[PDB]
């Protein structure tokens, strides 16, 4: 089980140092921005990363949210990335959840973070180019360990 410990305003950057942002149709993209541009483009570029206490450490359990008019939470259900219209709940029942991601440091890579889906073991958030635009996806990465799983998380209060 999980219990909400705090939230944090954050800018999530991918391996190319591009900022993650969500538009009108809950469409995640990565764009080259300065931190002031990301603050200026809030609330499309500022994520609410809610940290949770886990009854079984794996390690840092996080939900990733964004506020448009309403709040939508990043989901990994059926190995598909979507933003469901909901608030991160104070308490989650099972050891696995579509909205819970385990945030960990990437071994040997100073300050880089990796986000594993609690619902699908060995499946991580990653960034892929869709011809010109870079996009967010869920991908099995325990074998490949693609550099694209590496994210930096910067606080924005």
């Amino acid at each position, epitope marked *: 089980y999980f219990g909400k410990l705090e939230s944090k305003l954050s800018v999530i950057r991918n391996l190319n140092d591009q900022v993650l942002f969500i538009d*009108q*149709g*809950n*469409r*995640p993209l990565f764009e080259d921005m300065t931190d002031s541009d990301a603050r200026d483009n809030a609330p499309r570029t500022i994520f609410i990363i809610s940290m949770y206490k886990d009854s079984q450490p794996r390690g840092m359990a996080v939900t990733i949210s964004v506020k448009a008019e309403k709040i939508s939470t990043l989901s990994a259900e*059926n*190995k*598909i*990335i*979507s933003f469901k219209e909901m608030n991160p709940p104070d308490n989650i029942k099972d050891t696995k959840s579509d909205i819970i991601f385990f945030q960990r440091s990437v071994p040997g890579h100073d300050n880089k973070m990796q986000f594993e889906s609690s619902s699908y073991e060995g499946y991580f958030l990653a960034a*892929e180019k*869709e*011809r010109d635009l870079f*996009k*967010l*996806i*869920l*991908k*099995k990465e325990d074998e490949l360990g693609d550099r694209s799983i590496m994210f930096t998380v910067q606080n924005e209060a």
Partner: antibody
């Protein structure tokens, strides 16, 4: 042809009743391993019928209740290809068959990319 | 669980170029906003136009507009251009993988 995101299906099939058949759908320009691929049947002059999905990375399948046991869906992970097969064709299997990518991140759960279709004719 | 039945109406629509077409879609139970619209032209694969009942896909003209929630859905095509005349299918994805399509509506030129 590339580096555009696409699904390319194998050519027109003309078969006799009782023959077996396997048709293909090769994905390119994206991580084929990581998106579900669906098969859709379109009978001549009729609508779209979902037949089943396959997750290429691990070959997890989800058949429609209508098509469960009638066809086999499969994939070759290394070759980024999904397949649809019949063990014994009937004339009523005569239709256009589409493979389509299920959206993730962008357009989640919809069919965002489609192959050009494989026409199958079953006749004596 | 028994499949959600999508009902599209009318089967055919005759509308003049420059006019407005109103395509209807009905779900046999509530699907919230879990609906997509596809266009299909002769000898071609369908293409995604609308997702999540009201959001336009890639390079979909502003003239196309989707709306609805729960059980009743509508695709409105204002100022019809020649390229807009085609068959349109709706698809529910309320509890994916259990997806279903409507039987479509053919939109033909009124002259």
């Amino acid at each position: 042809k590339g580096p555009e995101v696409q699904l390319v299906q194998s050519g027109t099939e003309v078969k006799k009743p009782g023959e077996s058949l396997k048709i293909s759908c090769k994905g390119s320009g994206y991580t084929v391993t990581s998106y579900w691929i669906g098969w859709v049947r379109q009978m001549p002059g009729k609508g779209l019928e979902w037949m089943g999905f396959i997750y290429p990375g691990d070959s997890e399948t989800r058949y429609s209740p209508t098509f469960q046991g009638q066809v086999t869906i499969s994939a070759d992970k290394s070759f980024n290809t999904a397949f649809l097969q019949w063990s014994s064709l009937k004339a009523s299997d005569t239709a256009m068959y589409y493979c389509a990518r299920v959206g993730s991140g962008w357009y989640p759960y919809t069919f965002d990319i489609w192959g050009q279709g494989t026409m199958v004719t079953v006749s004596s | 669980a028994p499949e959600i039945v999508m009902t599209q109406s009318p089967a055919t629509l005759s509308v003049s170029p420059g006019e407005r077409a109103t395509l209807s879609c009905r779900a046999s139970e509530s699907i919230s906003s879990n609906l997509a619209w596809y266009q299909q032209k002769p000898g071609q694969a369908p293409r995604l136009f609308i997702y999540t009942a009201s959001t336009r896909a890639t390079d979909i003209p502003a003239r196309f507009s989707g709306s609805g929630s729960g059980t009743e859905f509508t695709l409105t095509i204002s100022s019809l251009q020649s390229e807009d005349f085609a068959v349109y299918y709706c698809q529910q994805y309320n509890n994916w993988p259990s997806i279903t399509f409507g039987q479509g509506t053919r939109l033909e030129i009124k002259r």
